[PDB]
Design an enzyme around this catalytic site. Sequence first.
Site, PDB file in Angstrom:
ATOM      1  N   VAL A   1       2.693   1.734  -3.253  1.00  0.00           N
ATOM      2  CA  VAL A   1       1.825   2.149  -4.353  1.00  0.00           C
ATOM      3  C   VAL A   1       1.327   3.575  -4.165  1.00  0.00           C
ATOM      4  CG1 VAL A   1      -0.455   1.763  -5.340  1.00  0.00           C
ATOM      5  CG2 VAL A   1       1.127  -0.155  -5.091  1.00  0.00           C
ATOM      6  N   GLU A   2       0.944   3.934  -2.939  1.00  0.00           N
ATOM      7  CA  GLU A   2       0.370   5.254  -2.703  1.00  0.00           C
ATOM      8  C   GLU A   2       1.410   6.359  -2.852  1.00  0.00           C
ATOM      9  OE1 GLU A   2      -2.511   6.250  -2.609  1.00  0.00           O
ATOM     10  OE2 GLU A   2      -3.650   4.382  -2.414  1.00  0.00           O
ATOM     11  N   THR A   3       2.615   6.160  -2.310  1.00  0.00           N
ATOM     12  CA  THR A   3       3.628   7.204  -2.303  1.00  0.00           C
ATOM     13  C   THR A   3       4.998   6.763  -2.796  1.00  0.00           C
ATOM     14  OG1 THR A   3       4.223   6.746   0.003  1.00  0.00           O
ATOM     15  CG2 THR A   3       2.485   8.361  -0.397  1.00  0.00           C
TER      16      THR A   3
ATOM     17  N   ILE B   1       0.834  -1.200   0.000  1.00  0.00           N
ATOM     18  CA  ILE B   1       0.000   0.000   0.000  1.00  0.00           C
ATOM     19  C   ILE B   1       0.871   1.254   0.000  1.00  0.00           C
ATOM     20  CG2 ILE B   1      -1.490   1.393   1.477  1.00  0.00           C
ATOM     21  CD1 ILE B   1      -3.194  -0.440   0.050  1.00  0.00           C
TER      22      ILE B   1
ATOM     23  N   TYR C   1      -6.182  -1.456  -9.178  1.00  0.00           N
ATOM     24  CA  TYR C   1      -5.465  -1.025  -7.986  1.00  0.00           C
ATOM     25  C   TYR C   1      -5.268  -2.194  -7.026  1.00  0.00           C
ATOM     26  CZ  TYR C   1      -4.529   1.454  -3.591  1.00  0.00           C
ATOM     27  OH  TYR C   1      -3.981   1.882  -2.407  1.00  0.00           O
TER      28      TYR C   1
END
Length: 304
Positions: free
Chosen positions: A100-102, A97, A288
């Site tokens: 992927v997010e940052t 997570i 996603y």
Amino acid sequence: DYDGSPQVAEFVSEMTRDYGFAGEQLMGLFRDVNRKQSILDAISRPAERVKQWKEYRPIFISDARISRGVDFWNKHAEDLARAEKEYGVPAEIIVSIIGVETFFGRNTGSYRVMDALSTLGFDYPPRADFFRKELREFLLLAREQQVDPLSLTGSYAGAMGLPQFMPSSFRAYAVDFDGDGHINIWSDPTDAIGSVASYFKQHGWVTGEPVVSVAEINDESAESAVTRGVDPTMSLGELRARGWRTHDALRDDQKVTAMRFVGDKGIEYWVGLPNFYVITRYNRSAMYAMAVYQLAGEIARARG
Ligand SMILES: C[As](C)(=O)[O-]
Ligand SMILES: [Ca+2]
């Protein structure tokens, strides 16, 4: 900008009335808040060409992304082991997570949350009411942390820190995971680790249940069962009655989705199990969730 807006004054009136803020100081804050033209252009953009799995997956399962994911894991292995023991959420999922997010901090956010949520909540009508709720939770969360509201950054829509929590998710899920008294999801990876795990557990993650299952179809009319979106509408027993066969001999009674990806080497059929639906609660997208699940697999492979 927001020095004397009528709506801004009506937001400060609700803040001092329902949540006990001092209106005078609150209006001294909005004097220092900037309306971001670039944010309005971004969210005013129309439908953006959605990508085929063939092209979406390689953007997030790259050697660089995996490699930095093993380094992030090595560095915080003890906090990840703590988060997985307490919240029942896999460590590779937490790392995935955040990767992927940052990208593990490389893209935490370019705007001050105060600018983003104000620009949206007061200058974007289609969802102004939503982004004024987030603005309210943000002033509340800045008060709780005893931090100053202009020092916090985030995305153009106000998602903050390593896990990209919007303010309301911060207040409802983020946790102080290293026992120092603050919740710093911006630069304290421990709180990021614990916060993601608290999010997943509170969105229905069942520890030990599988996430996805490779599927086959008896007939092309079974593709009529492909889930439009990420919300399940049938049990696995239903979907199997429609011509879908999962390689895994999993129970019938459970809510599932059915996915048809155009993958690297042909059409791919997947059944998303409930835990897979928990991942989409982080970002309503089937690709996603698949990119997160597979990325967590690659990082667990490379770490050993
Ligand atoms: C955008 As979120 C992870 O706070 O729902
Ligand atoms: Ca902390």
